[model samples]
Target: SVDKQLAELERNANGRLGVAMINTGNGTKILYRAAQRFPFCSTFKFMLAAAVLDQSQSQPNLLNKHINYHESDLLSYAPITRKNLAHGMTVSELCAATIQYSDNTAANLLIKELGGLAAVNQFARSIGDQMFRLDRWEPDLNTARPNDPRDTTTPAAMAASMNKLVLGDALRPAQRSQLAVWLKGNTTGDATIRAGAPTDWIVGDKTGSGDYGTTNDIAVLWPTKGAPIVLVVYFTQREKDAKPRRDVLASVTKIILSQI
Candidate 1:
């Protein structure tokens, strides 16, 4: 059923779309053009969260530690900046803002706090995600530099990374719990994957968008009656029609829900 529906969605899609859906309970995977690497966009924040939480094991109070924020740290599409908290925020709070609001400023702060991009790359590899790379800060979609390999991932890699975060031993129990809480509270992409699923179903997801027609949402969907599902959907070569792309994501999700 998944094979038929996902193939249909791919056949009808306008641009290059990559999808990787895993039914964790049975280890069943549904993939469509999943090997292609695409700009990860803000999805890198999820990796950043894992790296930070991993570091917390060495320093128990790391999450509570505060980091200063200068005016230059402010960036477009950041909800944290609107708060105007002169005292700045703790590492934990920034992680929350990064995932919950998809805040660019908060993402950069966390990246810096976690020892920059190299650390993130190292952490990703350490967790067995060799295909993932974090080479730039947030909002750097790298569309102009099409050749740039910065901040890129394949749908397969993203789905695997998410599996490591949720089902594997990539992070400590406490860190995993914290990250899960933040992901479940993500407020972005209401009209994307969440739009297609039933209101009662729990969806923990992060959304990414950029100027160069990149729209992505990686989510863990929990059905009330069935095992949880991990879905990674990515689109490129998009037109300016955001609604259509989002609807495509929702439609794909709806198809998945029908069988489960």
Candidate 2:
């Protein structure tokens, strides 16, 4: 069984792994330590983007809104946002940078636009994800402290909320597709889920890494053969907090895809 193999993987992981996969086509579910809490890391940007889209539904012209920030505002890993600091960026452009490029500055800026970290947590609750929470900003949130519960979410909770926002009716159709566009064009994750997914299958993913050897990827996959699949993989070595292993994430992705 998938769970059995995944358990074996966890035994040898030197840490712990959390996974949740749902096949919307057939109502199939695969879970492994999925209810356990894990740090969100940069992956929170995906939810941040969704929350912005939710707000845009009523604003009508929110996407056209532009924001200006000083050069000092830029954070490490903000490749896209730093490049456009001179001219500022639109709400829409910030979303793209946050999701596609994992720009820390863009995400922090968008968090403010959505009213802040608490508001972002409420966005998850409104989507029926009781387990999603954001207690800090970018570099801080990625702390991945063991059992701190701050800025942590269970695998099932992430899959649940992502399923709704990414693949369900949580947002209007046009807005939803726009979110998909950003996710589908992500520049990272080439060596994670994208590498493990079948050659013909199309995948869009958001990845996160943190201190304590934490690594995470959440994805919505489309295959030539079946219904869309939403998969979440989160692993961490809190005490070790060593550099994350991309190879480990890729191998876990392969194990999950093999079952569905």
Candidate 3:
């Protein structure tokens, strides 16, 4: 049944796609081109959050810390920018905004606060993910070239990292709980993985979209009666239109949930 469903997904896909699904309870997995690297987009935000939480362990007040915002910090896709709050926000709030809204300004702020791309990469390595790379900031239009490999990751690596986070291996239980709360509130990817799932199921996810037809959704699906499932789906060099690409992901997700 999995194979049949996968074949149909491949047939319906409009471009290159990578998928990695892991059962958190038993380590069972389904991988389709899961080893290939693709632009990580905003899904990388989860890693950024982990790195921040890692620091918060040493400085318990870190999340409560606030930073001033200037006009220069503003960028596209930032809900905070629209808010135009002059007083600024706390580290915890920014992190929540980053995941819940995929806010570019909030993400850039965290990246800088965490000591830039190198620190993020170092944290990834610390977690045993050597292939993950973070080389650019959000809305950095200069690096948004078609098929650019900057800030890329493999579905396998992403899924593994997610598994570590969800299974409480990558963070303290309290920190993991905070991250889970943020993820569960994520507002993006409604038409992707979330669209196909049962209405009552809890899906914690992050989404990424970029130039050259790059679209991605990664999630931890919590069934009402079973162990959670982690799913990562990415599309690259797809047709310019997003609807068809999103539909393909939704179809695959629906089928997977049905059989699982």
Candidate 4:
């Protein structure tokens, strides 16, 4: 049933998509093109946040720990200040912007503070997601980094990472709760996964986009009565011009939500 629904969603998108869903409670998974890795863009922030929080000794309430962003750091995303950084956000605040807003500055700052890019990559491998990497933290610093190439991840791995977070296996319970809260407020550049759920349903997710026709979102949808599900959707070859893709993705989410 899940496969059939996914097929319909892909057909609607003209077959340029990948999707993965899992019920964290039982580890039951459903996937379609889910193993295909494409440029993850900001969705990788979730991983970065987890690594940052896991490695940090700071308690969740310490507001003194902050990451400042300059004008040069604002890469097509909004500037997040220590003041506007959302209240009551500990390591969770870091994870929130990374997820909900896909804030580049926040992500890069966290990556820099939390043992840099190499450490986060190591954490990814530790979690069994060897293919996912920290592609670019602050790309402008080095001329050697090409503009065209970006970070990537498979749908399956994305879903699994979300599961780990949900299961309180990534960070401490308080940190995970903070991440979930931030994800709930994720108001970012894209809205693919949350577009079609019931108005009352609360969806928490992170969206990633890049210059290379890549658009992706990974989400955890919470319904008041049912088990929550992790949904990962990725689209490549859609390009930066992929405006119409949301309709297809929204339709897919509608179908999936109806079944769940």
- Clashes per model (N, Cα, C within 3 A): 0, 2, 0, 2
In candidate 1, which residue ranges exceed 4 Å CA deviation? Answer: 1-8, 142-148, 238-244
Best by lDDT: 2
RMSD of each: 2.2, 1.1, 2.1, 4.3
Give the per-residue lDDT of model 3 (tens digit) for 144-252.
3556668898999999998888764788999988988898999887889999898888999988877656778889888888788999987766444434367777877
Full-model lDDT for every candidate: 0.81, 0.89, 0.82, 0.67
Per-residue lDDT tens digits of candidate 2, residues 1-260? Answer: 77788788878777789999999998888988989899989888999999999999999999999799888779978998888989999999999999998999998899988988999988888999899889988778887777889998999999988899889999999889998889899988898888888888888999998889898999998989878999999999847548887777788889988886
Off by over 4 Å in 4: 57-63, 68-72, 82-95, 138-150, 238-240
- 247, model 4: CA deviation in Å? 1.8
**lDDT of candidate 1 over 137-168, digit per residue (tens):** 76665351343566789899999999889767
Q: Which residue pairs come into collision in candidate 2? A: 212-241, 213-241
Number of clashing residue pairs, candidate 1: 0
Q: What's the TM-score of each model vs. the native?
A: 0.92, 0.97, 0.92, 0.81
> Cα deviation of 254 in candidate 4 (Å)?
1.8
Q: Output the better candidate (1/2) by TM-score.
A: 2
The candidate 1 region of ten consecutive residues with least summed lDDT is 236-245
